[PDB]
């Protein structure tokens, strides 16, 4: 019993953190193999963070401008490359601790692990969800660029994230690993900011699944509705569509509960337009939506 | 900016976890040296769980009796003994792995990291706080016992909890690594139940604190409060007496955000007795207590 925010297992990621320093900036790389992966902007100044250009500062760094260091180890830099927002340090050890890994791109909805960084050391551990205006309501200080995000398939690395910068309201934006940024944010200081976001109604239904699971049965109804009508109530409620693939995700929660989808509907509208008269779902007192049916099914009893 | 539940890097403790199995029961041990530890009850039949005599049930075992397993690596058990409620299996092997260690016990409000184990295969991390009645409020099923809790100090993994049991409420029981019980529980099938809780006081201010770090200030005022007439309200709301040692502990926090303790303590009595009027703190529509004041000042910005 129990259901907490779990993230997979770091180990597999803190032996593969580095540091990276060009001239005075120091943050955090991923060793794969004889290569290290990290942001771009390790190679600006300060004062030429407003409109810099990347191609002009690369050209004039060489090898020796960058010092990786994996823990006490001092790794050479053989070579350098961009690759779109991200830079590629050749490095002349391969890392004995590559784990089989793959560079996966996640959907806006999809939850990962974060393992949080500074100057190449691991501090912390913790779950995250690519929010559908493609910020994350991360948890990053002076120094975290760099980090990744991760989820784990038997005894494969899934990196989806690495950690580029903060927006005025607080919360993060950053590149899959080829470099490519989630949503429409430059690696550079403007007046950008977190747009418009929505509530992820398939994951705010697995949730309410994860809370029968675990014996939290009050918001349940007799009712029913129909996709249609459940869909204009979640337009007025500023949350994500419910399309008849999300009804077919949620299927094994819906068998194992045997709550028919358009049922946990009903519960979801009547908990949206009366709230919760002062109870609790999973030690909740709002409508939580950075699980996903995957990791409600991960973490809960099969019975 | 932002505020997760943080965990430690697991890394450290994945490299201890092994699989224990005596006759038809595996559960999860913690490989030390050429020690590993595990859950008493692995000794038990089922019918027998109801009134086991464990000093009974060893003295009939043999080194032979327990298969030990480092992922597919077999270590020959050639000791065993018992201390409290942990069985303290010799083996021919030191592991490697064995990080700097303690075994510290923990106090009711203080939180640690747990890392949730299946066949000696680590799935997942979480932070958990020691409740005041000693029970958790964990994640765990079948085959989860031998799952431990931890937090690092620099190099050093701290030991404080072995996962033993589920309590009927669906919170969880464990000991120290010296085999100790928190709380008043016990390793057979009884009718025990979790004690009346209530809410840590401390780590509230504590949270209260990391909101205003990170720009939450709705629920601030001019008002402050005396310590005894907080402690008034905190009796009437079943909260923990503030005490002089938590207003030292929280002198820190309270100097960064120039916010006095009884101060805060103003807000919390007035977020007790109004409530929230649909607002939230950090993500979160309740008075969150499973954060320190250490959590706090380990994981937010020093400005
Ligand atoms: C409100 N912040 C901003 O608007 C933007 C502006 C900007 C955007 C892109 C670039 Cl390339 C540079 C600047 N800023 C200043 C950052 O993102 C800081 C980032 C990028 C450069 C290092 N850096 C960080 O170490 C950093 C990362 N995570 C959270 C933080 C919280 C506190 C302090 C620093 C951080
Ligand atoms: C409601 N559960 C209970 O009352 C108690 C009774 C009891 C107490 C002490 C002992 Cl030594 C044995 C039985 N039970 C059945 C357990 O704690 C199961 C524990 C102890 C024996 C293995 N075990 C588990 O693998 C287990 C652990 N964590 C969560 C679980 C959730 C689901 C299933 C199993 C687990």
Known sequence: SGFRKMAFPSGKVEGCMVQVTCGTTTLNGLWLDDVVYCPRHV????????????????????????????????????????????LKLKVDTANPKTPKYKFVRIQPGQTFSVLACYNGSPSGVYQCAMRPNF???????????????????????????????????????????????????????????????????????????????????????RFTTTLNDFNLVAMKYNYEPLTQDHVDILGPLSAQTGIAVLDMCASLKELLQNGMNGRTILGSALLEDEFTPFDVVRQCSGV
């Open 135 to 221: 910020t994350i309501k991360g948890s990053f200080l002076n120094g975290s660029c760099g980090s990744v995000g991760f989820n784990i398939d038997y005894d494969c690395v899934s990196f989806c994230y690495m950690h580029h910068m903060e927006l005025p309201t607080g919360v993060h934006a950053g590149t899959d690993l080829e470099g490519n940024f989630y949503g429409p944010f430059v690696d550079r200081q403007t007046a950008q900011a977190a747009g418009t976001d929505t509530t992820i109604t398939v994951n705010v239904l697995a949730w309410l699944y994860a809370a029968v699971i675990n014996g939290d049965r009050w918001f349940l109804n």
């Open 43 to 86: 190679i600006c100044t300060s004062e030429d963070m407003l409109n810099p250009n990347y191609e002009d500062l690369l050209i004039r760094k060489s090898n020796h401008n960058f010092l990786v260091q994996a823990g006490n180890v001092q790794l050479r830099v053989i070579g350098h490359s961009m690759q779109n927002c991200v």
